[PDB]
Coordinates of N, CA and C in Angstrom, one line a residue:
Chain S
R14 N 222.6 129.9 168.0 CA 221.8 130.9 169.4 C 222.6 129.5 170.6
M15 N 222.1 128.6 170.3 CA 221.6 127.5 171.7 C 222.9 126.6 171.0
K16 N 223.2 126.3 170.1 CA 223.4 125.0 168.9 C 224.6 126.2 168.9
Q17 N 224.9 126.8 168.8 CA 226.7 127.7 168.7 C 226.9 127.8 170.1
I18 N 226.6 127.5 171.6 CA 226.9 127.3 172.5 C 227.2 125.8 172.8
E19 N 226.7 124.5 172.8 CA 227.0 123.5 172.5 C 227.9 122.5 172.0
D20 N 227.9 124.0 170.5 CA 228.9 123.9 169.7 C 230.5 124.6 170.4
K21 N 230.3 124.8 171.1 CA 231.4 125.5 172.0 C 231.7 124.5 172.9
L22 N 230.6 124.3 173.6 CA 230.9 122.5 174.8 C 231.3 121.6 174.6
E23 N 231.6 121.3 173.1 CA 231.9 119.9 172.8 C 233.4 120.3 172.3
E24 N 234.1 122.2 171.3 CA 235.0 122.1 171.6 C 236.1 122.4 173.1
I25 N 235.2 123.1 173.9 CA 236.6 123.0 175.2 C 235.8 121.6 176.0
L26 N 235.1 120.3 175.3 CA 235.3 119.6 176.3 C 236.7 118.3 175.9
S27 N 236.8 118.5 173.9 CA 238.1 118.1 173.8 C 239.1 118.2 173.8
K28 N 239.1 120.0 174.4 CA 240.1 120.7 175.3 C 240.2 119.9 176.8
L29 N 239.2 119.9 177.2 CA 239.5 118.7 178.3 C 240.4 117.8 178.6
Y30 N 240.0 116.9 177.6 CA 240.2 115.7 177.5 C 241.7 115.7 176.7
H31 N 242.2 115.9 175.5 CA 243.6 116.7 176.0 C 244.2 116.6 177.1
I32 N 244.1 117.2 178.0 CA 245.0 118.6 179.2 C 244.7 117.0 179.8
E33 N 243.7 115.9 180.1 CA 243.5 115.0 180.9 C 244.8 113.8 180.7
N34 N 244.8 113.3 178.9 CA 245.9 112.7 178.6 C 247.2 113.4 179.1
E35 N 247.7 114.4 178.7 CA 248.4 115.3 179.0 C 249.1 115.1 180.5
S36 N 248.1 115.1 181.2 CA 248.5 115.2 182.8 C 248.6 113.8 182.8
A37 N 248.0 112.8 182.2 CA 248.4 110.9 182.7 C 249.7 111.0 182.2
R38 N 250.2 111.3 180.9 CA 252.0 110.9 180.3 C 252.4 111.9 181.4
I39 N 252.0 113.2 181.9 CA 253.5 113.7 183.1 C 253.2 112.7 184.0
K40 N 252.7 111.7 184.9 CA 252.4 111.4 185.7 C 253.2 110.0 185.4
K41 N 253.2 109.5 184.7 CA 254.2 108.4 184.1 C 255.2 109.0 183.9
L42 N 255.3 110.0 182.8 CA 257.5 110.9 183.3 C 257.6 110.8 184.9
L43 N 257.2 110.6 185.8 CA 257.5 111.3 187.1 C 257.8 110.1 187.8
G44 N 256.5 109.0 188.5 CA 256.7 107.5 188.5 C 255.7 106.9 188.0
Chain B
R28 N 224.5 140.2 177.7 CA 224.3 139.0 177.2 C 224.0 137.4 176.0
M29 N 223.3 136.3 176.1 CA 223.8 135.5 174.9 C 224.8 136.3 174.0
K30 N 225.6 137.8 174.5 CA 226.6 138.1 173.8 C 227.6 138.5 175.0
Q31 N 227.6 138.1 176.5 CA 228.8 137.8 177.6 C 229.1 136.3 177.7
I32 N 227.9 135.3 177.4 CA 228.3 133.6 177.1 C 229.5 134.1 176.1
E33 N 229.6 134.5 175.2 CA 230.4 134.5 174.3 C 231.5 134.7 174.4
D34 N 231.8 135.3 175.1 CA 232.3 135.8 176.2 C 233.6 135.7 176.4
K35 N 233.0 134.9 177.0 CA 233.3 133.8 178.6 C 233.5 132.7 177.6
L36 N 233.3 132.0 177.1 CA 233.8 131.1 176.0 C 235.2 131.2 175.3
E37 N 234.9 132.4 175.2 CA 236.2 132.5 174.4 C 237.7 132.8 175.1
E38 N 236.9 133.3 176.8 CA 238.0 133.5 176.9 C 238.3 132.3 178.2
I39 N 237.0 131.2 178.8 CA 237.2 130.0 179.1 C 238.1 129.2 177.7
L40 N 237.9 129.0 176.6 CA 239.1 129.2 175.6 C 240.3 129.1 175.5
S41 N 240.8 130.7 175.3 CA 242.3 130.3 175.7 C 242.8 130.1 177.0
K42 N 241.6 130.1 177.9 CA 242.7 129.7 179.0 C 242.8 127.6 179.2
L43 N 241.4 127.1 178.4 CA 242.6 125.8 178.0 C 243.6 125.8 177.1
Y44 N 244.1 127.1 176.4 CA 244.9 126.7 174.9 C 246.1 127.0 176.2
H45 N 246.1 128.2 177.3 CA 247.3 128.2 177.9 C 247.5 126.6 179.3
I46 N 246.6 126.6 179.1 CA 247.3 125.5 180.1 C 247.8 123.9 179.7
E47 N 246.8 123.7 178.1 CA 247.8 122.8 177.3 C 249.2 123.2 177.1
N48 N 249.5 124.4 176.8 CA 250.8 125.0 176.7 C 251.4 124.7 178.3
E49 N 250.9 125.0 178.9 CA 251.6 125.4 180.5 C 251.6 123.8 180.7
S50 N 251.1 122.7 180.3 CA 251.4 121.0 180.4 C 252.1 120.2 179.2
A51 N 251.7 120.9 178.1 CA 253.0 120.4 177.6 C 254.6 121.0 177.5
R52 N 255.3 121.8 177.8 CA 255.9 123.0 178.6 C 257.1 121.9 179.6
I53 N 256.1 121.5 180.6 CA 256.3 120.0 181.3 C 256.5 119.0 181.2
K54 N 255.6 119.0 180.1 CA 256.1 116.6 180.0 C 257.5 116.8 178.8
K55 N 257.2 118.3 178.3 CA 258.3 118.7 177.3 C 260.2 118.3 178.5
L56 N 260.1 119.0 179.5 CA 260.5 119.5 180.5 C 260.9 117.6 181.1
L57 N 260.2 117.1 181.7 CA 260.6 116.4 181.6 C 260.8 115.3 181.1
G58 N 260.9 115.3 179.8 CA 261.3 114.5 178.7 C 262.1 115.1 178.8
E59 N 263.3 115.1 178.5 CA 264.8 115.4 179.4 C 266.0 115.1 180.2
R60 N 265.0 115.2 181.3 CA 265.2 115.4 182.9 C 264.3 114.0 183.5
Chain R
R21 N 217.1 130.3 182.3 CA 217.7 129.8 181.2 C 219.4 130.4 181.0
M22 N 219.7 131.1 180.1 CA 220.7 131.9 179.3 C 222.0 132.6 180.9
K23 N 221.5 132.8 181.9 CA 221.8 132.8 182.7 C 222.1 131.8 183.3
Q24 N 221.7 130.8 183.6 CA 222.0 129.4 184.2 C 223.2 129.4 183.7
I25 N 223.5 129.7 182.1 CA 225.0 128.9 181.4 C 225.5 129.7 181.5
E26 N 225.8 131.1 181.7 CA 226.1 132.0 182.5 C 227.3 131.7 183.7
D27 N 226.3 131.8 184.0 CA 225.9 130.6 185.9 C 227.6 129.6 185.9
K28 N 227.3 128.7 184.7 CA 228.1 127.8 185.1 C 230.3 127.9 184.7
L29 N 229.5 128.8 183.6 CA 230.9 129.8 182.6 C 231.8 130.1 183.1
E30 N 231.1 130.4 184.6 CA 231.3 131.3 185.4 C 231.9 131.2 186.3
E31 N 231.4 129.5 186.7 CA 232.3 128.1 188.2 C 232.9 128.1 187.2
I32 N 233.1 127.4 185.3 CA 233.7 126.6 185.0 C 235.0 127.1 184.4
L33 N 234.8 128.4 184.2 CA 236.9 129.2 184.1 C 236.5 129.3 185.7
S34 N 236.1 129.1 186.4 CA 237.0 129.1 187.9 C 237.6 128.1 188.5
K35 N 237.5 126.9 187.8 CA 237.8 125.8 188.1 C 239.6 125.9 187.0
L36 N 239.2 126.7 185.8 CA 240.5 127.0 185.1 C 241.3 127.5 185.1
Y37 N 240.9 129.0 185.9 CA 242.1 129.1 187.1 C 243.2 128.7 188.1
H38 N 241.9 127.7 188.9 CA 243.2 127.0 189.9 C 243.2 125.9 189.4
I39 N 242.8 125.2 188.2 CA 244.5 125.1 187.4 C 245.5 125.3 186.5
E40 N 245.1 125.8 186.8 CA 246.9 126.8 187.0 C 248.1 127.5 187.2
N41 N 247.1 127.7 188.1 CA 248.0 128.0 189.5 C 248.6 126.3 189.6
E42 N 247.7 125.7 190.0 CA 248.3 124.5 190.1 C 249.8 124.2 189.3
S43 N 249.5 124.3 187.7 CA 250.6 124.3 186.8 C 251.3 124.5 187.6
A44 N 251.3 126.2 187.4 CA 252.2 127.1 188.1 C 253.2 126.4 189.2
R45 N 252.3 126.2 190.3 CA 253.0 125.2 191.0 C 253.7 124.2 190.9
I46 N 253.5 122.8 189.9 CA 254.0 122.2 189.9 C 255.7 121.9 188.9
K47 N 255.7 123.4 188.1 CA 256.9 123.9 187.6 C 258.0 124.6 188.1
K48 N 257.8 124.8 189.5 CA 258.4 125.6 190.1 C 258.9 124.8 191.0
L49 N 258.2 123.1 191.7 CA 258.2 121.5 192.3 C 258.9 121.1 191.0
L50 N 259.4 121.2 189.6 CA 259.9 121.0 188.8 C 261.2 121.1 188.4
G51 N 261.3 122.6 187.8 CA 262.5 123.6 187.9 C 262.2 124.7 188.3
Chain G
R15 N 218.9 119.5 173.8 CA 218.6 120.7 173.9 C 218.8 121.9 174.6
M16 N 218.4 122.7 174.9 CA 218.9 123.7 176.5 C 218.9 122.1 177.5
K17 N 218.6 120.5 176.8 CA 219.3 120.4 177.7 C 219.7 119.5 177.8
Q18 N 220.5 119.4 176.8 CA 222.3 118.7 175.9 C 222.9 119.5 176.3
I19 N 223.1 121.0 176.5 CA 223.6 121.4 177.2 C 224.1 121.4 178.1
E20 N 223.3 121.1 179.1 CA 222.9 120.8 180.9 C 224.1 119.3 181.2
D21 N 224.2 119.0 180.5 CA 224.5 117.8 180.4 C 226.2 118.0 180.3
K22 N 226.7 118.1 179.4 CA 227.4 118.7 179.1 C 228.5 119.2 179.6
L23 N 227.5 120.7 180.1 CA 228.1 121.0 181.7 C 228.6 120.4 182.8
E24 N 228.4 119.6 182.9 CA 228.0 119.4 184.1 C 229.0 118.4 184.0
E25 N 229.5 117.7 182.7 CA 230.2 117.0 181.5 C 231.7 117.7 181.7
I26 N 231.8 118.6 181.1 CA 232.7 119.5 181.7 C 233.5 119.6 183.2
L27 N 232.1 120.8 183.8 CA 232.4 119.7 185.5 C 233.5 118.9 185.8
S28 N 232.4 117.6 186.3 CA 233.6 116.7 186.7 C 234.4 116.5 185.7
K29 N 235.0 116.4 184.4 CA 236.5 117.1 184.2 C 237.0 117.9 184.4
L30 N 237.0 118.8 185.1 CA 237.1 119.7 185.4 C 238.5 119.3 186.7
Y31 N 237.0 118.5 187.7 CA 237.7 118.9 189.2 C 238.4 117.3 189.4
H32 N 238.0 116.3 188.0 CA 239.0 115.0 187.7 C 240.7 115.7 187.4
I33 N 240.9 117.0 186.5 CA 242.0 117.3 186.9 C 242.5 118.0 187.6
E34 N 241.6 118.7 188.2 CA 242.6 119.0 189.5 C 242.7 118.4 190.7
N35 N 242.3 117.4 190.3 CA 242.8 115.5 191.5 C 244.1 115.2 190.0
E36 N 243.6 115.0 189.3 CA 246.0 114.6 188.9 C 246.1 115.0 189.1
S37 N 246.3 116.6 188.6 CA 247.4 117.6 189.4 C 247.7 117.7 190.4
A38 N 246.7 117.7 191.4 CA 247.0 118.3 193.2 C 247.7 117.1 193.3
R39 N 247.8 115.5 192.8 CA 248.7 114.4 193.3 C 250.0 113.8 192.3
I40 N 250.4 114.6 191.3 CA 251.4 115.4 191.3 C 251.9 116.0 191.9
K41 N 250.9 117.1 191.9 CA 252.4 118.7 193.3 C 252.2 118.1 194.6
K42 N 251.4 116.8 195.2 CA 251.7 116.3 196.0 C 253.0 115.2 196.4
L43 N 253.0 114.4 195.2 CA 254.2 113.4 194.7 C 255.3 114.4 194.9
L44 N 255.9 115.3 193.8 CA 257.1 116.2 193.7 C 257.0 116.5 195.1
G45 N 256.6 117.0 195.9 CA 256.4 117.7 197.2 C 256.9 117.1 198.3
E46 N 257.4 115.4 197.8 CA 258.0 114.3 198.5 C 259.4 114.4 198.1
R47 N 259.2 114.4 196.9 CA 260.5 113.5 195.9 C 260.4 114.9 195.5

């Protein structure tokens, strides 16, 4: 139930961390 | 209900994979130009 | 309870839509 | 519990605002160069 939502949320945040590093990379590649 | 949640979380999820992809593309763009 | 999670999820996806348009913009600005 | 959820959702949330910001910055970058 709730464990299951959380667990998704833990995944989703992890995609969100990856998405930041990527943005961080692109800024560097830019200036 | 708890199943509308589940669908939306899967949808959040695909949208995440989609955006990793669009940004990877650009990173890769710039990574030659 | 659950209404409340959903409602957050509905918001979070909406930030995720905005984040795409932005990426879409940047690609355009790039090539 | 249902409160670990709430914290993480707020954290997902700030991370969203953070990334809108980092991408807006770049859009704005490129928007002159």
